[PDB]
């Protein structure tokens, strides 16, 4: 208990350091900036074909192909320009809650309640899509999966751990421990040297891929954390929680800058993503619609209300041209 | 409008759609059964009959394919993945009648679990089948061990019938939405082997109700 009191003593020191650095607020600096006008987005495409709830999606690096995972046991690679289905990959386990697209475009990944991440090879000598490797070693359900390159993947699981894999060997290169709850979301920094993880204990942590230790820890939320997204610069990230509240954290200041919460919203937040410039912050909610938040003044500037059930996945292209939202109504929609 | 390659791509997409529709039609025939039993509540006994995460059992009875999902291997929070199972035909629940004495008492924990899943947000219109297994030991244990040690508000004898009826009534009384949901209580008969028949009858009733709902007659 002596060490226990020391830990509380250090937490007092940590809080003092954070308060000493809070000379002002983000809301007091952007008081003279011009407000972003009413952002009206329309549905250009409606990608149909899924027969069950859509749980995740990811864009390719070419901003044209996207992969979607639904609980019917199917991965579909769509051509969003022409609404064509390039591929339809059948899964061995229909309980899939995550999907990923490799930066090169040769591999896609998926995972879920079966505690295995499956890597698929899209460009083979034959004409089918083959299962390359099945990464196992997690004792909990898989929440998110992101590619580092064609050989390394990072996986967040519900067993309070994140892991780094080497695909060619199938083993864990680095294992990340320190969360006290189920990890739900995971975002990679633009330099692929650091990544943030949000768990069920209302905490966000910054890890170091090459080293393997928790550089920083972030608190402030009151409930479960369901989404995380890196700022395009790489010195900030946004979180989404079940208490109808987004927040914008900072790495260099080690503090919370802004909170995006309204009074008429009481539902959870399922997906959080940014625009190309970082001025807009798209967020999906349980109330069947998505809102566009302005990241610098925390005032709502748009509502996307074309869906019939809970919006579960939301992504923005690499060039910022389109925002695609998928919901539990088995429809994807490309907004512009 | 379109080149030859674009037309062939459209044909490939249209064949993908046809195969997807065929797969969905085939999958709609199967019956989804969750088995969310309690700890040490005779789940091994209920999966013993069929005539590292989710464990799936596929058995057929009277030309109806049943897919049973044992999810008891998940040690994480139930709320985060409980919505993945909405749309199941039925939820098979197993409690141990011989765990009234063995203890936090197991029976009260089973009651809290049943109350948690019966009043859940996603399971308003999903029927729950309740199995009261391990009844052989209860017959001899009720004589030596009275039920009053666990249920002070009981005014019955020590016979097996009255105690079993009291347990069943208390388990069904935890239901709240008694308009679109039903509880099918049954005692596991090892020799008679009517468990599969009971599951078949419950699934048939659920299918009839769902068809009435879909036609517009409900």
């Amino acid at each position, epitope marked *: 208990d002596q060490l226990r009191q020391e830990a509380e003593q250090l937490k007092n020191q940590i809080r003092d350091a954070r308060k000493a650095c809070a000379d002002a607020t983000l809301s007091q600096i952007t008081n003279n900036i011009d407000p972003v006008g009413r952002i009206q987005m329309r549905t250009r495409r409606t990608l149909r074909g899924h027969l069950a709830k859509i749980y995740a999606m990811h864009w390719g690096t070419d901003s044209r192909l996207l992969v979607s995972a639904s609980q019917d046991g199917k991965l579909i690679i769509w*051509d969003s320009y022409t609404t064509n289905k390039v591929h339809a990959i059948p899964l061995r386990s229909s309980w899939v809650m995550t999907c990923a697209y490799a930066p090169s475009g040769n591999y896609v990944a998926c995972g879920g309640l079966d505690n295995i991440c499956s890597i698929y090879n899209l460009k083979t000598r034959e004409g089918n899509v083959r299962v390359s490797r099945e990464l196992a070693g997690h004792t909990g359900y898989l929440s998110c999966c992101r590619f580092l390159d064609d050989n390394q993947i990072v996986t967040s699981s519900g067993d309070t751990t994140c892991a780094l894999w080497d695909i060619e060997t199938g083993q864990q290169t680095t294992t990340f421990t320190g969360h006290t709850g189920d990890v739900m979301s995971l975002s990679l920094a633009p330099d692929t040297r650091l990544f943030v993880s949000g768990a069920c204990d209302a905490s966000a942590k910054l890890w170091d891929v090459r080293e393997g230790m928790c550089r920083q820890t972030f608190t402030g939320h009151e409930s479960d954390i369901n989404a995380i997204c890196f700022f395009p610069n790489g010195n900030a990230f946004a979180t989404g929680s079940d208490d109808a509240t987004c927040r914008l954290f900072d790495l260099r200041a080690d503090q919370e800058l802004m909170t995006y919460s309204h009074d008429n919203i009481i539902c959870g937040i399922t997906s959080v993503s940014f625009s190309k410039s970082g001025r807009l912050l798209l967020a999906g909610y349980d109330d069947f619609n998505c809102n566009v938040w302005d990241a610098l003044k925390a005032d709502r500037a748009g509502v996307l209300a074309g869906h019939d059930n809970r919006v579960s996945c939301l992504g923005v292209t690499d060039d910022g041209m389109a925002v695609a939202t998928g919901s539990w109504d088995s429809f994807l929609k490309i907004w512009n | 409008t379109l080149s030859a*390659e674009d037309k062939a791509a459209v*044909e490939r997409s249209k064949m993908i759609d046809r195969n997807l529709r065929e797969d969905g039609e085939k999958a709609a025939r199967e019956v989804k059964l969750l088995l969310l039993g309690a700890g040490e509540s005779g789940k091994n006994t209920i999966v013993k009959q069929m005539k590292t995460g989710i464990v799936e059992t596929h058995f057929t009875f009277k030309d109806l394919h049943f897919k049973m999902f044992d999810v008891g291997a998940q040690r994480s929070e139930r709320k985060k993945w409980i919505h993945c199972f909405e749309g199941v035909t039925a939820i098979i629940f197993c409690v141990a009648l011989s765990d009234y004495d063995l203890v936090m008492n197991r029976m009260h924990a089973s009651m809290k679990l049943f109350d948690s899943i019966c009043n859940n947000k996603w399971f308003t219109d999903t029927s729950i089948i309740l199995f009261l297994n391990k009844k052989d030991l209860f017959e001899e244990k009720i004589k030596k061990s009275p039920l009053t040690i666990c249920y002070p508000e009981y005014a019955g004898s020590n016979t097996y019938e009255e105690a079993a009826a009291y347990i069943q009534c208390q388990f069904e009384d935890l239901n709240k939405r008694k308009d679109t949901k039903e509880i099918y209580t049954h005692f596991t008969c090892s020799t008679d082997t009517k468990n599969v028949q009971f599951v078949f009858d419950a699934v048939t009733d659920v299918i009839i109700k769902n068809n009435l709902k879909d036609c517009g007659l409900f």
Partner: single-chain antibody
Amino acid sequence: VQLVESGGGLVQPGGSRKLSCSASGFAFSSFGMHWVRQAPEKGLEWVAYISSGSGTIYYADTVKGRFTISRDDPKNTLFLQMTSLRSEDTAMYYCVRSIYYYGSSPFDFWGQGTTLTVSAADIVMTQATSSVPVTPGESVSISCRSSKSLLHSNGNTYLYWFLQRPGQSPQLLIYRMSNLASGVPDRFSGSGSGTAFTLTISRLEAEDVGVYYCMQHLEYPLTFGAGTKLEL
């Protein structure tokens, strides 16, 4: 991945014959199939095309009416039934597979061929230079011209390049004028715009000798070129 064709031989004029091709090593049911024939001491010529799903069949006007194409998915075989064979049907028929989705590589694998000897509005592609004296090490540029603009409104220029080594089958090099085929060395580069195209090789070796063909795929029928020999 290999395609072996069986059949052919000596057929009297006015007769009938069936050519068979056996495919092993790849998902046959997902690939479209073509028939391309080469007359003795002449260029390539298109014959027929059958798609995946057997929902679209096209023939060349030369052979339309008497030639029939078919596929048997469960047995992994391709068929071509010929009736009333003329003296212009003597050639060595090759079987070419092709798949069409976004980012595909059509005309990627060719068969070995069967020799068939008988007794006795289309887009035109111009490859004027029939031969080039070459030395190993220098850069070689090979051009091919077109009549209609191959640049579609999508942004793709449907031009294809092929290599035929002496005693071998044609092999894909460049598809859509800019993308390299798999297994092709990086010394091959394709460029051009509108109706004029060129192909450049940086460092020529002793394995690059052969005949170069240019093909269009904007609309059917698919017309080949005349060839450019690259003897040393």
